[PDB]
């Protein structure tokens, strides 16, 4: 009866946008798998924080399905996610089974690369807007967190806590999110 | 002419309180060394995020001095910091040369263990207040970030961004902190 989350970690990922949702989701009792795009080896993030994934993406793919797939940001991390056929397969499957997809900052641009969620309202980092809107396939929002159907997006490292708590609320409900939030000493 | 920061990483450290300051400080051009208390081996943080340190504490000790020493929180991480003679030596030296000392959440309780900064105004996580105030050696503050002389403290994971930007402001000045802050998409 435990919810499962998949976090896809690629080189160049924004380490804050990776660790905050993983940490907060585990505080909420969610079983999180941090999967390395390139394998089990340690991943050098955009500001040179090196994180050891729990599993390779190939192995984590086999232990699905997941209630949420999480795409961190980081310009180079998002590009690696956009170019990966394994990610395309995971996202299309997640879209078909009406699972939640979450991406933050530059992460949403991978949704465009893989033709995911066209027609949805989305947000990105302001610097990634032009890339996300190429072709007019989405409607752009400037909300710090945006949720349209099964697509949940957020803007930047400074929105990571709201992004993560929105995932908790979608999976475990508003009360669990509120309980998890109080010991964090967030402003609002 | 580059400022240097030492971040001491021990098992049980709060991974958000470790990665956010490291990331933000490197965005500010600060040379950050994430030093493992127990050696170069990967460190399992409080929510099971595993981080590879840049160096062992023994090696990083030799490449000082540092303009700031950073003590992350996490109850079990702070206890490991409180029990380490190597940390006592680093902090006493840093106090003597009037360097900046920064600790967040449960991290400040290590200052009490090592008799650092007595008489200063400090803050902690609300749950760590009683431990920090044993003996009345400090004056307690409920500010999200508190700075008294060379002692800079903060309350929790949700204050990590303000904590980190306060370090940047102390080392590199208000303008650099403001420049680094804008792309983060923080609320206030």
Could you tell me if B129 lies within 8 Å of chain A, comparing CB atoms? Answer: no
What is the nearest CA distance from A157 to chain B, expressed in angstroms?
5
Burial track B51-72 (b if 16+ CB lie within 10 A, e otherwise): bbbbbbbeebbeebebbbbbbb
| Alpha-carbon Rg for chain A in angstroms | 15
Q: Do A183 and B19 touch (CB under 8 A)?
A: no
Residue B188 to residue B177: CA distance in whole angstroms: 13
Q: Residues 33-52, chain B: which have Cβ within 8 Å of A?
A: 34, 42, 47-52
- Note whether A102 and A153 are within 8 A (CB): yes
Q: Do A26 and B19 touch (CB under 8 A)?
A: no
Residue A158 to residue A138: CA distance in whole angstroms: 23
Residue A45 to residue A42: CA distance in whole angstroms: 10
What is the nearest CA distance from B115 to chain A, expressed in angstroms?
27
Count of C-beta atoms within a 10 Å radius of residue A143: 14
If you write DSSP's letter for every residue of B46-89 in order, what string do you get? TTS-EEE-SEEHHHHHHT---SEEEE---HHHHHHHHT-HHHHH
Tokens of A64: 């699905």
Instruction: Report DSSP state, residue B14.
Output: -
Looking at chain B, list the stretches that DSSP marks H as alpha helix, in order from N- to C-terminal side: 15-27, 57-62, 75-82, 85-96, 109-113, 129-132, 160-172, 174-181
- Resolution, rounded to a tenth of an Å? 2.0
- Note whether A122 and A138 are within 8 A (CB): yes
Per the listing, tokens 């949720």 go with: A147
Q: How buried is residue A1: exposed, middle or buried, by Cβ count under 10 Å (0-12/13-18/19+)?
A: exposed
The CA angle A69-A73-A76, to the nearest 5 degrees, is 120
CA dihedral sign of residues A124, A122, A84, A42: positive
Could you tell me if B164 lies within 8 Å of chain A, comparing CB atoms? Answer: no
- Note whether A46 and A12 are within 8 A (CB): yes
| SS3 call for B148 | strand
Q: Which residues pair with A151 in a beta bridge?
A: A101, A148
Could you tell me if A182 lies within 8 Å of chain B, comparing CB atoms? Answer: no
Phi, psi of B95 (to 5 degrees): -65, -40
Tokens of A34: 């941090």
Residue A91 to residue A117: CA distance in whole angstroms: 10
CA proximity to B72, closest of B160, B5, B165, B132: B160
Axis-axis angle for helices A15-27, B15-27 (nearest 10): 160
Q: Residues 65-84, chain B: which have Cβ within 8 Å of A?
A: none
List the catalytic residues of B.
105, 125
What is the nearest CA distance from B184 to chain A, expressed in angstroms?
5
CA proximity to A163, closest of B102, B185, B22: B185
CA dihedral sign of residues B8, B14, B15, B19: negative
Residue B55 to residue B148: CA distance in whole angstroms: 30
Instruction: Report DSSP state, residue A138.
Output: S
Q: Which residues of A touch B142 (CB under 8 A)?
A: none
Q: Do B26 and A48 touch (CB under 8 A)?
A: yes
Q: Which domains does chain B have, with CATH numbers?
A: 1-187 (3.40.50.880)
CA proximity to B167, closest of B41, B72, B64: B72
Burial track A158-184 (b if 16+ CB lie within 10 A, e otherwise): bbbbbbbbbbbbbbbeeebbeebbeeb
Instruction: Report DSSP state, residue B98.
Output: T
Phi, psi of A160 (to 5 degrees): -65, -40
Q: Which residues pair with B153 in a beta bridge?
A: B103, B146
Q: Which residues pair with B103 in a beta bridge?
A: B71, B153
Per the listing, tokens 């610097």 go with: A127
CA distances from A105 to A13, A153, A159, B8, B34 (A): 11, 8, 9, 29, 26
Looking at chain A, list the stretches that DSSP marks H as alpha helix, in order from N- to C-terminal side: 15-27, 57-62, 75-82, 85-96, 109-113, 129-132, 160-172, 174-181
Beta strands in A115-170 (DSSP E): 121-122, 139-140, 145-148, 151-154
Find the closest chain B residue to A155 by CA distance.
B185
Find the closest chain A residue to B27 by CA distance.
A47
Residue B3 to residue B173: CA distance in whole angstroms: 12
Could you tell me if B159 lies within 8 Å of chain A, comparing CB atoms? Answer: yes
What is the nearest CA distance from A51 to chain B, expressed in angstroms?
5
CA proximity to A71, closest of A121, A26, A10, A158: A10
Q: Give the method used.
A: X-ray
Q: Residues 99-128, chain A: which have Cβ within 8 Å of B?
A: 125-127
Phi, psi of B55 (to 5 degrees): -160, 165
> Given A15, A50, A127, which is nearest B23 (Cβ)?
A15
Could you tell me if B16 lies within 8 Å of chain A, comparing CB atoms? Answer: yes
Residue A111: CB partners within 8 Å, gap ≥ 6? Answer: A71, A91, A101, A103, A117, A122, A151
| SS3 call for B166 | helix
Residue A93 to residue A114: CA distance in whole angstroms: 12
Per the listing, tokens 């641009």 go with: A109
Tokens of B165: 């930007």
| SS3 call for B97 | coil
């Amino acid at each position: 009866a435990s919810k499962r989350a998949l976090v896809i970690l690629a080189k160049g990922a924004e380490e804050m946008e990776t660790v905050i949702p993983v940490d907060v989701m585990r505080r909420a009792g969610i079983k999180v798998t941090v999967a390395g795009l390139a394998g089990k080896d340690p991943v050098q993030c955009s500001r040179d924080v090196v994180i050891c994934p729990d599993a390779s993406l190939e192995d984590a793919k086999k232990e699905g399905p997941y209630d949420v797939v999480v795409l961190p940001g980081g310009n180079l991390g998002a590009q690696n996610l956009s170019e990966s056929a394994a990610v395309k397969e995971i996202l299309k499957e997640q879209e078909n089974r009406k699972g939640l997809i979450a991406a933050i900052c530059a992460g949403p641009t991978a949704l465009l690369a893989h033709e995911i969620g066209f027609g949805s309202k989305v947000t990105t980092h302001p610097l990634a807007k032009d890339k996300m809107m190429n072709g007019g396939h989405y409607t752009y929002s400037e909300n710090r967190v945006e949720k349209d159907g099964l697509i949940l997006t957020s803007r930047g490292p400074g929105t990571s806590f709201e992004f993560a708590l929105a995932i908790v609320e979608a999976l475990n409900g508003k009360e669990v999110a509120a309980q998890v939030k109080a010991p964090l000493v967030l402003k609002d």
